[PDB]
Amino acid sequence: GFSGADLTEICQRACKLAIRESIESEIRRERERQTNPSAMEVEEDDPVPEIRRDHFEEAMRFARRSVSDNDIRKYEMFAQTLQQSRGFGSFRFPS
Amino acid sequence: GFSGADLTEICQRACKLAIRESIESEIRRERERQTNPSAMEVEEDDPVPEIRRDHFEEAMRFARRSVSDNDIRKYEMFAQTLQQSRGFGSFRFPS
Amino acid sequence: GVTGAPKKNTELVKVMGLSNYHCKLLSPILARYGMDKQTGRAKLLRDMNQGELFDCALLGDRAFLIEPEHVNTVGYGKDRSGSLLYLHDTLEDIKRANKSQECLIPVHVDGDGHCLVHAVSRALVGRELFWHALRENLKQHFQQHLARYQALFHDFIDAAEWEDIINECDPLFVPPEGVPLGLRNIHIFGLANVLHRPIILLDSLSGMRSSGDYSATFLPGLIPAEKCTGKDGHLNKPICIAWSSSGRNHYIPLVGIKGAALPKLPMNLLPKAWGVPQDLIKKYIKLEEDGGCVIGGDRSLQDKYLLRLVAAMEEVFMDKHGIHPSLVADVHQYFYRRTGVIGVQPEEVTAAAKKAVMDNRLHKCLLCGALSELHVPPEWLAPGGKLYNLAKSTHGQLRTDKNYSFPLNNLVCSYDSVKDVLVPDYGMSNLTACNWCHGTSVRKVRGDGSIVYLDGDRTNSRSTGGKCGCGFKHFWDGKEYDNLPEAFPITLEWGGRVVRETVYWFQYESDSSLNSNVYDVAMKLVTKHFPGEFGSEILVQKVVHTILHQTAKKNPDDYTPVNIDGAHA
Numbered sequence: 001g002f003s004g005a006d007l008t009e010i011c012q013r014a015c016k017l018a019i020r021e022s023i024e025s026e027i028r029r030e031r032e033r034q035t036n037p038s039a040m041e042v043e044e045d046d047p048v049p050e051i052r053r054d055h056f057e058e059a060m061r062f063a064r065r066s067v068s069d070n071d072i073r074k075y076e077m078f079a080q081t082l083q084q085s086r087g088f089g090s091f092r093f094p095s
Numbered sequence: 096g097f098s099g100a101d102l103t104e105i106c107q108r109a110c111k112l113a114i115r116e117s118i119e120s121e122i123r124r125e126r127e128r129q130t131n132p133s134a135m136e137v138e139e140d141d142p143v144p145e146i147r148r149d150h151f152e153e154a155m156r157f158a159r160r161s162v163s164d165n166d167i168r169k170y171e172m173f174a175q176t177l178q179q180s181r182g183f184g185s186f187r188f189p190s
Numbered sequence: 191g192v193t194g195a196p197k198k199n200t201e202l203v204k205v206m207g208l209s210n211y212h213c214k215l216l217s218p219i220l221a222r223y224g225m226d227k228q229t230g231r232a233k234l235l236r237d238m239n240q241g242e243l244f245d246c247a248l249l250g251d252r253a254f255l256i257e258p259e260h261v262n263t264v265g266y267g268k269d270r271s272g273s274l275l276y277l278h279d280t281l282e283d284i285k286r287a288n289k290s291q292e293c294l295i296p297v298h299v300d301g302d303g304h305c306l307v308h309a310v311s312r313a314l315v316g317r318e319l320f321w322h323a324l325r326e327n328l329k330q331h332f333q334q335h336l337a338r339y340q341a342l343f344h345d346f347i348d349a350a351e352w353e354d355i356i357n358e359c360d361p362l363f364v365p366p367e368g369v370p371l372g373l374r375n376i377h378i379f380g381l382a383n384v385l386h387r388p389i390i391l392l393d394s395l396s397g398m399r400s401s402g403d404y405s406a407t408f409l410p411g412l413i414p415a416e417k418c419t420g421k422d423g424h425l426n427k428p429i430c431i432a433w434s435s436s437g438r439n440h441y442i443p444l445v446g447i448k449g450a451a452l453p454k455l456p457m458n459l460l461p462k463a464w465g466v467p468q469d470l471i472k473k474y475i476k477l478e479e480d481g482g483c484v485i486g487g488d489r490s491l492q493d494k495y496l497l498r499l500v501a502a503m504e505e506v507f508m509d510k511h512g513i514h515p516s517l518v519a520d521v522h523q524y525f526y527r528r529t530g531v532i533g534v535q536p537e538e539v540t541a542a543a544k545k546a547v548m549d550n551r552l553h554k555c556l557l558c559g560a561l562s563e564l565h566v567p568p569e570w571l572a573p574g575g576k577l578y579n580l581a582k583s584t585h586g587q588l589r590t591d592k593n594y595s596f597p598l599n600n601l602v603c604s605y606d607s608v609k610d611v612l613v614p615d616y617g618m619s620n621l622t623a624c625n626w627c628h629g630t631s632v633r634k635v636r637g638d639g640s641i642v643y644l645d646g647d648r649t650n651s652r653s654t655g656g657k658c659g660c661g662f663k664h665f666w667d668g669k670e671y672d673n674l675p676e677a678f679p680i681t682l683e684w685g686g687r688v689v690r691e692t693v694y695w696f697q698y699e700s701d702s703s704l705n706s707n708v709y710d711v712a713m714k715l716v717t718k719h720f721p722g723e724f725g726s727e728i729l730v731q732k733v734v735h736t737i738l739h740q741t742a743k744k745n746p747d748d749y750t751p752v753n754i755d756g757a758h759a
Contacts, residue, residue, distance in 0.1 A: 060186040074722045165742040176709040
């Protein structure tokens with residue numbers, strides 16, 4: 001029953017969880033390298049280049065619903081007010 | 096249950112009980128030494144140099160809880176409603 | 191009311207929740223079922239290939255060990271009957287052999303006529319759980335070695351008797367009239383061979399010097415001694431049994447005390463072999479250097495595992511019998527034991543109580559725990575019955591379109607044209623006063639064992655804490671709350687319409703999450719009374735502001751629970 005504007009949240013709160021895990025490991029790598037500057041170990045390309053499933057498996061824990069169930073049988077009941085005042089489809093031209 | 100601005104009157108009303116005492120012990124000393132204006136041994140360096148516990152013993156007597164326990168409920172019953180509208184939990188991608 | 195609750199019978203006394211009658215409702219299914227170490231679900235022995243009937247040979251290491259705190263229990267621990275004085279002459283050398291300590295004791299067993307294997311099962315696990323396998327497989331063990339049984343007893347037992355002897359192992363087969371209530375020693379010989387274990391049947395000092403061989407040492411003669419050892423390479427210490435009366439009709443098991451000294455049986459109290467050479471005492475019993483033998487053992491099963499196994503059988507017993515065995519047990523006590531008949535079949539109580547399950551005719555007392563039933567004989571509603579007469583002068587003609595409610599019996603009866611009977615929906619029938627103590631709070635019991643509580647009904651589950659004082663949990667809206675909720679009305683106006691609605695506001699719950707949350711209580715009402723109105727979000731704000739101002743109690747302990755008659759007064 002998710003709205004069209006709470007799938008634009010699941011697809012962003014699942015980016016912050018890959019942004020944060022990038023700066024984290026980017027910083028935490030410089031830490032250990034400065035712990036052993038003589039280690040010389042360089043040319044490390046990237047820790048996370050990719051949204052990397054098990055982000056969505058975590059962003060779904062903060063996924064709410066905008067329109068509750070009662071907020072649907074409020075419009076769907078208004079359609080059957082504009083409707084139900086119609087229905088002459090029984091009309092048929094004789095002969 | 097003290098706010099962030101009711102700990103700033105256990106820390107000022109604990110100073111207006113030192114200003115009082117250090118501004119009284121100055122005056123009382125002045126009338127005192129007019130009994131011996133020829134003493135020439137007057138002017139003690141400091142009568143009260145220090146906030147000096149047994150002031151917080153007294154300033155704690157005028158400490159008022161700003162937010163009553165019947166008003167902190169209105170918020171704790173909000174944030175718990177932002178939760179419980181969440182938690183897709185057992186969500187798990189296949190395989 | 192001193193007598194408002196009948197004393198619990200030996201079959202009905204529940205030790206750690208386990209009663210003999212309850213175990214009798216689970217033991218026959220244990221004959222082909224086992225407990226699973228991972229799921230805890232019962233599993234057919236067909237899948238784990240232990241045979242169709244439970245192989246009692248694995249039980250040779252099983253000896254019951256009684257705790258001192260459970261000795262005083264009637265039907266579980268020490269027998270209180272005259273067997274206490276009976277065995278004292280034997281108890282004189284039982285104690286003194288183990289340096290004057292009580293090491294071997296008689297144990298009370300249900301007197302339903304099959305106590306022999308009941309005692310042996312009580313000799314093995316101390317419960318009535320493994321007894322049923324002891325007989326059915328014994329009948330097969332008799333058949334497989336009947337020729338070898340013939341080799342010894344064809345000159346002592348009639349050839350036609352062996353067909354009757356195997357009939358003795360039949361579980362519910364009632365022998366013809368005149369048979370003394372008790373099983374012969376021939377089973378124990380097979381049982382000793384079946385268990386891969388010696389079995390010792392004792393009697394008084396007079397019994398040993400009596401010229402009868404009814405007290406003898408049953409050795410596994412049909413099974414070689416290397417097969418009569420435990421998994422540690424040691425011979426299985428024998429289980430001991432005794433005669434419980436001078437009439438020789440009830441068997442008792444002799445077991446040691448859990449955590450105490452291992453019983454040692456002196457030579458004068460060690461009887462001669464039964465049907466096998468005397469030299470087999472040395473071969474089949476782990477014998478000591480002093481001339482005696484060790485009784486009981488330390489390779490025993492703790493009661494913690496057996497508690498799962500009983501629960502592991504109540505699992506399938508849901509599917510197979512459509513009823514709970516404890517629920518059957520109470521039906522036995524309150525309706526079958528009500529007639530005073532001793533020895534009622536468990537199977538009849540199981541099947542018939544399902545009728546009470548189907549129509550919800552069980553109504554359990556909430557104060558003394560009595561299980562009451564609204565049982566009406568069929569003719570009472572048929573022509574000539576009591577309620578049959580009332581419908582005519584109180585509400586006129588028997589009408590197929592008119593239901594007849596009988597407040598005196600709380601039965602609401604429709605008139606079925608073909609049968610000419612008034613049919614009360616016993617689901618709609620409600621007992622209002624107990625027929626044991628006349629307690630007004632008597633409530634239905636469902637087939638799953640769940641009691642049909644109502645709002646304000648106090649459950650038997652212990653309250654972990656609460657201002658109620660009742661010490662029990664309370665049931666509400668399908669949930670169990672430690673306290674009863676404060677209630678006070680609310681005032682709703684929307685679209686010109688006005689609604690009275692009463693608001694129940696739980697508070698002071700031991701578990702935090704169960705306390706009321708205004709943003710759910712308010713939303714529930716508006717949805718419940720205004721489904722699909724536009725702009726109701728404004729109404730909810732007005733509602734919330736009211737409840738908060740009403741629950742703002744000056745003293746947090748200002749507790750004024752709901753006033754429900756009967757639960758609290």
